[PDB]
Write a protein that binds this ligand. Sequence first.
Ligand SMILES: O=c1c2c(n3ccnc3n1Cc1ccc(C(F)(F)F)cc1)CCN(Cc1cccc(Cl)c1)C2
Ligand SMILES: O=c1c2c(n3ccnc3n1Cc1ccc(C(F)(F)F)cc1)CCN(Cc1cccc(Cl)c1)C2
Ligand SMILES: O=c1c2c(n3ccnc3n1Cc1ccc(C(F)(F)F)cc1)CCN(Cc1cccc(Cl)c1)C2
Ligand SMILES: O=c1c2c(n3ccnc3n1Cc1ccc(C(F)(F)F)cc1)CCN(Cc1cccc(Cl)c1)C2
Ligand SMILES: O=c1c2c(n3ccnc3n1Cc1ccc(C(F)(F)F)cc1)CCN(Cc1cccc(Cl)c1)C2
Ligand SMILES: O=c1c2c(n3ccnc3n1Cc1ccc(C(F)(F)F)cc1)CCN(Cc1cccc(Cl)c1)C2
Ligand SMILES: O=c1c2c(n3ccnc3n1Cc1ccc(C(F)(F)F)cc1)CCN(Cc1cccc(Cl)c1)C2
Ligand SMILES: O=c1c2c(n3ccnc3n1Cc1ccc(C(F)(F)F)cc1)CCN(Cc1cccc(Cl)c1)C2
Ligand SMILES: O=c1c2c(n3ccnc3n1Cc1ccc(C(F)(F)F)cc1)CCN(Cc1cccc(Cl)c1)C2
Lengths: 175, 174, 175, 173, 174, 174, 174, 174, 174, 175
Amino acid sequence: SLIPIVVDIYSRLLRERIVCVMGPIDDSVASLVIAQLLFLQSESNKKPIHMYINSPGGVVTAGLAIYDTMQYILNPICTWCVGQAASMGSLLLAAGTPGMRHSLPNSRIMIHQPSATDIAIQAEEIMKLKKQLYNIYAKHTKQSLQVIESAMERDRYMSPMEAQEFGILDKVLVH
Amino acid sequence: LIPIVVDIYSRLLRERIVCVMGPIDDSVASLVIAQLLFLQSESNKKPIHMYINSPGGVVTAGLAIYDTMQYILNPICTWCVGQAASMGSLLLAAGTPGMRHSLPNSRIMIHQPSATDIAIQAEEIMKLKKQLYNIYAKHTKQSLQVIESAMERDRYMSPMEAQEFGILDKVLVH
Amino acid sequence: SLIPIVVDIYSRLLRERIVCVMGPIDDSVASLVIAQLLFLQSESNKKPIHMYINSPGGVVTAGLAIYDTMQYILNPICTWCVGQAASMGSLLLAAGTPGMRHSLPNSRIMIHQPSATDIAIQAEEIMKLKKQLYNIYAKHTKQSLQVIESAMERDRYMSPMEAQEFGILDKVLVH
Amino acid sequence: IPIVVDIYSRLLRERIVCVMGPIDDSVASLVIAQLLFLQSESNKKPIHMYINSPGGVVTAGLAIYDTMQYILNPICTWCVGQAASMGSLLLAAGTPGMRHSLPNSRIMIHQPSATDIAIQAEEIMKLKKQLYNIYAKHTKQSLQVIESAMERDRYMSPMEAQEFGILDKVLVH
Amino acid sequence: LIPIVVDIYSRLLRERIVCVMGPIDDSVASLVIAQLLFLQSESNKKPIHMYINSPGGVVTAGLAIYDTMQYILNPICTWCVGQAASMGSLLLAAGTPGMRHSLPNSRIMIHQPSATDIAIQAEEIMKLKKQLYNIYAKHTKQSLQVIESAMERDRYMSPMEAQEFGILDKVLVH
Amino acid sequence: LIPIVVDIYSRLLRERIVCVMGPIDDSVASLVIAQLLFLQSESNKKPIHMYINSPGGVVTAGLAIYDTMQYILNPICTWCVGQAASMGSLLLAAGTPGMRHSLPNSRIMIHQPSATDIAIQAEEIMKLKKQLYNIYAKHTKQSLQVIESAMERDRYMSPMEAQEFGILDKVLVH
Amino acid sequence: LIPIVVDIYSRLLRERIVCVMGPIDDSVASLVIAQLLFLQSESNKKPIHMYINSPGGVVTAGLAIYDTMQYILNPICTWCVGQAASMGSLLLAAGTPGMRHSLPNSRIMIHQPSATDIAIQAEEIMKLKKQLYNIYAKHTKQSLQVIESAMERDRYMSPMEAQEFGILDKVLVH
Amino acid sequence: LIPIVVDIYSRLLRERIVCVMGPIDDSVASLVIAQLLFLQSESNKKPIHMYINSPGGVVTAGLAIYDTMQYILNPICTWCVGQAASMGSLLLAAGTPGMRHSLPNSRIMIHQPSATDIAIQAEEIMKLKKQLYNIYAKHTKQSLQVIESAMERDRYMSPMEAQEFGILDKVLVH
Amino acid sequence: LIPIVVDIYSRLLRERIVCVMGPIDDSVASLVIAQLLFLQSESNKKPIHMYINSPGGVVTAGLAIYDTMQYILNPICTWCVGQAASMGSLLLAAGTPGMRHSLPNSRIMIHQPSATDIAIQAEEIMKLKKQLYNIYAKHTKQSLQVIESAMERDRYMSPMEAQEFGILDKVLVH
Amino acid sequence: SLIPIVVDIYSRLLRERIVCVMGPIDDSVASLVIAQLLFLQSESNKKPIHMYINSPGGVVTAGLAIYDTMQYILNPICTWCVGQAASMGSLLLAAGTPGMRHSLPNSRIMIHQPSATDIAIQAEEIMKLKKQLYNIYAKHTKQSLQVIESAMERDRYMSPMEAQEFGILDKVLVH
Ligand SMILES: O=c1c2c(n3ccnc3n1Cc1ccc(C(F)(F)F)cc1)CCN(Cc1cccc(Cl)c1)C2
Ligand SMILES: O=c1c2c(n3ccnc3n1Cc1ccc(C(F)(F)F)cc1)CCN(Cc1cccc(Cl)c1)C2
Ligand SMILES: O=c1c2c(n3ccnc3n1Cc1ccc(C(F)(F)F)cc1)CCN(Cc1cccc(Cl)c1)C2
Ligand SMILES: O=c1c2c(n3ccnc3n1Cc1ccc(C(F)(F)F)cc1)CCN(Cc1cccc(Cl)c1)C2
Ligand SMILES: O=c1c2c(n3ccnc3n1Cc1ccc(C(F)(F)F)cc1)CCN(Cc1cccc(Cl)c1)C2
Ligand SMILES: O=c1c2c(n3ccnc3n1Cc1ccc(C(F)(F)F)cc1)CCN(Cc1cccc(Cl)c1)C2
Ligand SMILES: O=c1c2c(n3ccnc3n1Cc1ccc(C(F)(F)F)cc1)CCN(Cc1cccc(Cl)c1)C2
Ligand SMILES: O=c1c2c(n3ccnc3n1Cc1ccc(C(F)(F)F)cc1)CCN(Cc1cccc(Cl)c1)C2
Ligand SMILES: O=c1c2c(n3ccnc3n1Cc1ccc(C(F)(F)F)cc1)CCN(Cc1cccc(Cl)c1)C2
């Protein structure tokens, strides 16, 4: 509700190839984001797609569904963190095309996983998910598994500069 | 809410894309069934694509979709993104042979969770589970014994081991 | 994301002479179903009207309202059971035109009544209603009154092929 | 709850354990404790068990059943009001010749459509088959007739229950 | 709280007064049955008095009390004050002949309101109603036809109309 | 609810007027951010007007709007009507210098109330609090020490006094 | 549930009739303000009519409307129907002098109820009452003392008492 | 609602019969521990009997009871009636060797349900399962592998399967 | 509920055993404080035993117990069974040196979860966090830097590893 | 519940002339505390009474009711702050007999009033209450009104040392 019409603002964002992942991640967000990503690739397999992330995280399998769609599609993907990017949110941020992951000056980044689950699962599977994130995180930051898991073991946010040095993003820009 | 293009969920249907992601209930089954029959009227032979990201749901609602997939003449490509558990993996395994896919980081589970339209007797719950035994055995080409033994474990499968088991055919990445 | 549009899908099903009854049978479902049947008869008193049934049952008087409407209209009525047809659902399925009652391979049929009432009723009327089902069931299955009453007391589901042998449906189709 | 020269504590002084309600784990524990206490008082004096239950958790009912067979005491079961599902199983498990009903009591063996924990289909069936053998044992009915009867969602009269083997005597006073 | 006398509800039991004031449920049934069995153990022949001010309740719980009244050897005086509807009037009518009482302004109803422990079938609810037909006919000395015909009307009866019907015998003022 | 004029909230947007009335959360932030980014596409440097009547809200959502205001090239005139507390006053103070306004009877508060998207540790709440210090110090031209002292007090300030503090520049009447 | 004409509330605003019926909160305030600013853009000189049937509301939101009325150049006729209490009567008294009206049975109360957007200190609520004191004193042209004593009485006023006090100018029936 | 004898649950504890019926939580654990420590103070050598009818519960609370059994010097006879699942079967298997019993129809399950006192990380839940693995392996005398494969199956065991697996020693009926 | 022995929780107190099982709040703090102050009155220097199986709780309530332990003259043996997290581990580490124990399968965590009596500012939460640093550093004999690093990690430690960290001194089995 | 018996611990505290004001202040706490204070004076008008405070504050009129009882009774009153003493709690702490107000090392003290009310009242009365506290606070700390109101205007806790220097208490003791 209370969405203005322009000549619809969220639909007008999509004509600029901008997908929003604001808010928590659940299955409905994942399907909606995925549909827009596949739609944007069908318009052009070569024009860049932009993703604005202001998310506290969400369901792990729903987040991996988006991540896999980003890897699948051919388009370069520029990720933009505004507000914060925590848990799966920071993973999507880190999953952008190298050199095209940006953050605003006062944005917050967190890779620690929250202490999320569609259905009840056992620790053998919940741990498989955590390692699944380890390898994904290690891939895109170019850090060893020892470095990724140790950082994520600590509950703390990073400044946009700090997430750049750890390897989550490439550019902390102001204007 | 849902953005408008050139509505995006109607636009997915415009490409012969049916989504069965999210939990399966009787109304979800009816809606999916309506879309499959509508797509068959467009072309009895052009392929239908079905995206699965479901943790399962009502068994009779899942079988309603399954029987509808088997009924229509169209080839059906199943695509597992996110995860497919319980009835979700059955629909995934029920795709056209050679046309069942998953993305690299997907979770697949055939184990049934401990879902029910009405309270039923124990003989019917066993009659229903036996129905799933035969369906899984049909499309995975595994014996009944290995299927019943497999679902006994409350564990998920990776897309590559699910392929060797016969639930899907290709783990693609682009 | 509740309803897709076709090039409305539930209105398009109605353009195809297909009435679908999935949710549980209540007064609001009955009125809406009845309206479509009278609408489809006004379009053509002779083209077959189709009924897709996937219901766990519902209000008995609301089911009889649909049942009575089926008998009244002149059209041949093809009933199609997908998923399941229990209590009033199976009564509607069995009330189709003879030779036109179908089920899909893995569907469930149950005539046992669950242990259904708009308002509070006395025991005497509940028995009058149960007897009402006996005659409707006995009529359309061509089974004895006794075999119907003993069958319904058993709390079991039956497969489409034993349901065909019982007389509730005629064709278990395979495509 | 009235005091007498406590009324439920006084019933236990008369070797009467009352169920009279759904079979919880808490009901089962309390009933089981009373049976073990009454046996320790006397392994040979009969214990009376009053049943007015619509059933309950199956594992909790089997817990009581296992305790009844364990103790050496003759057990007189008395069904007043009604005895459905697990309730009728306890009724039929009394000592032979000592299972009674009041004239207007209700007996039901049909199982309701054991939810301590959510369970699988294979285990749920293993559980009813476990109930079949107990009923088959104590009614002296074949396994086939027991399973067919339980599939019918009907109540029995105290005479229908006496002839079926669930009880032995329908008395008025 | 309950006042203390030198406890008032326990003092009523010392006077062979059982209270059935309030709706009938299984927990009420256990207490009434327990007190009746206790009072019989004190004396097989001294009369027990039963105070009824109930709007009815669970049918199986009411019949459980009814069966206990018939079982014990004691004469039972039923006293209806306030009102006695559904099972309340059945217990009232089930007193010893010549000892069923009402106060001038009590309400009596045999009509059943529109058995309630668990969901049951149509044949069982009808079997339960037929049991009520025979019991009422036994203690009112009316034919079955007049019992059911009367019960179809939910009118309440005056303690006088109920006496002529056979539900009670002595409606007193002092 | 909302009137149509030859829609009133969309018509405010046609006049380059963004409204931040009400509490700030992530959904408010997304909408404000979208309108700010949209308004830049019509004109690189035409001024944008921002109406604030907010009691505050989520800090990360407030910083998200703040960063967007600083990012875009347009000069931004902020207008406080009613009140601007917590993050509300930060957005008000973050307008283009010389263009931060209040109406005569508005209340302004920079003290933060005792809020976050998720539960966080003590070190992060302090980092955010320090982040607010630096932003406030930057735009008020006050030292860090005086800013910290101002926020320590649970008091509101009048528009004409917020001007002397540096939160706004002009308190207008007509 | 709103009837449509050549929308009835949009047709009212189409004639410069702003409605403040119902309680004041921030969502009401934003809408009233937008309508006042919109009506000024069509004509800074055509009179605006404002209908008040409000029991009061949030004080900061009421002051926002008050500030918007004072800011715009239009003459504003306020019309009280039903009642105007707390902030409602403040908006009523804030109309253009000589253009404040009431209907015969409308009720006026200046007493403030015993709220605000957020929990605040005792000094801030007191700053607000003195702030309201001056507003009332300005437009009723009574001394500050007369306002404080009047608002202190938990009573409603008749439209004749309201004009004599200085809150309004005309009570018309036709 | 607990009957009194010369309290029935206090009379059970008076004979060294500790009951673990019902789900395990911290409040149950404290009480069981206190009873075990109390029974040891009367005699470090008289056997303690422990009745288990539990569907499981909090793992840390279950381990606290397990640690208390191992600490005290008394031989402990565990008795399974009804069922012993999750932590319940762990306490059952943790009895003194040769003194672990079950009744004929009691059910045993080692599969862990898909909780804990507080929300925790994936590594900590995994530390707990390996920790339970060693406990089960110790007292059933099966390899760690055999425990992990067994607990992986979402199935209950019969008392005969339970003794053969090493969880208990005797299934008695009399 | 609670057994009587010739009351079990009062009998633990007769043995100078205070139990801190369950979460800590002000009502828990008052009761523990009262028992600690009471136990000092029987004996100035007889050791007091403290059983901890707590996931933490209110920080000011936890410090209230901590200050009482430090205040009283008695040596205090702390015993961790089950788990001791957040304030729970602080009380465990606050025992008399050489007398802080854990049972083999206990879990210990000093990281604080992301709690307070009333809503507070960022400066106070940090002062309390720093207060916890100094207490932890004092009793573990670790530097402030290593303590802050330990608490930053959302992990539990085993009893034998908490010993090397200095939280406890002896992990006992019998 | 779960209160141990000693040979009752809260009743045994009262035989040691120790009143507990732990938890929030409401009318029921005030009456209960007041009754114990009057009882302790009736036992001895000259033996000291001890008050343990671990309170986040509460209803202002209920707190003033306790304060007035402390001033009325003749006994010396030793106040002890453990945990924290906020809003009205710190007022009761400050109201002890001079030289007999103590705190434990890690206790928290706050005079700022929370942002509490039996019934809805106007600002003229709510402000009268605040000034009523100003004069009470100024009395027992011996600070000017300007100093009291300015300190209380700032939202912050004090360390037990800091509350001593401001004048709330006299002794920060450890053993
Ligand atoms: O300003 C951009 C930016 C991008 N971008 C990509 C393609 N076009 C653009 N434009 C132009 C444009 C946007 C929206 C619309 C319309 F839809 F609202 F009309 C019309 C034109 C990329 C990233 N971003 C950076 C950014 C700044 C502030 C907050 C956030 Cl979260 C991120 C700016
Ligand atoms: O990209 C596809 C894919 C399919 N497919 C089938 C027909 N057309 C397509 N296109 C083009 C297209 C899609 C959507 C729209 C519109 F509706 F959004 F506009 C318009 C054109 C099938 C398989 N799939 C694979 C896939 C990769 C990543 C995640 C997921 Cl869940 C699945 C891609
Ligand atoms: O496919 C059919 C079937 C019937 N039928 C009757 C008339 N037309 C049809 N069509 C073609 C068609 C359907 C819908 C549309 C549109 F409206 F959606 F566009 C357009 C064309 C009846 C038999 N069976 C029914 C059925 C029910 C439930 C589960 C399954 Cl597996 C099978 C299929
Ligand atoms: O069929 C009728 C009936 C009446 N009637 C009156 C005028 N025209 C009609 N038609 C034709 C028609 C119906 C609906 C539509 C349209 F809504 F779909 F457009 C268009 C034409 C009343 C008499 N009878 C009543 C009736 C029988 C069975 C069950 C129910 Cl419940 C009620 C039916
Ligand atoms: O019968 C026992 C059994 C044990 N046992 C141990 C010590 N004494 C006994 N007695 C005698 C006794 C019990 C209770 C009391 C009193 F306190 F209630 F009065 C007095 C004497 C061990 C367990 N075993 C097996 C068992 C059977 C049925 C259900 C359960 Cl769950 C377990 C029975
Ligand atoms: O009447 C009995 C009956 C038994 N029995 C066994 C031992 N003593 C008895 N007495 C005497 C007595 C009862 C109660 C107390 C006191 F404790 F409540 F005061 C004291 C003495 C067995 C069961 N039988 C059958 C029965 C008939 C009616 C309804 C129910 Cl439900 C069951 C009755
Ligand atoms: O009056 C303005 C003011 C601004 N401004 C900026 C651009 N245009 C304007 N106008 C004209 C206009 C408004 C609304 C519409 C329409 F959309 F409703 F039609 C069309 C034209 C800025 C600041 N503001 C100050 C202000 C005073 C009172 C209350 C509030 Cl909340 C704020 C006035
Ligand atoms: O066994 C102890 C232990 C202590 N201790 C201290 C003083 N006395 C004892 N006893 C004897 C005793 C206990 C209870 C009672 C009574 F109250 F229940 F009767 C009477 C005597 C200290 C530590 N603890 C260690 C411990 C092991 C297992 C689980 C837990 Cl939670 C803790 C053992
Ligand atoms: O230890 C005291 C202390 C006082 N005091 C006053 C009179 N007697 C005492 N004793 C002896 C005693 C207390 C309780 C009982 C009994 F009731 F529990 F049995 C029996 C004897 C005053 C203040 N206080 C300081 C204090 C330390 C720890 C926490 C807190 Cl909140 C405050 C200690």
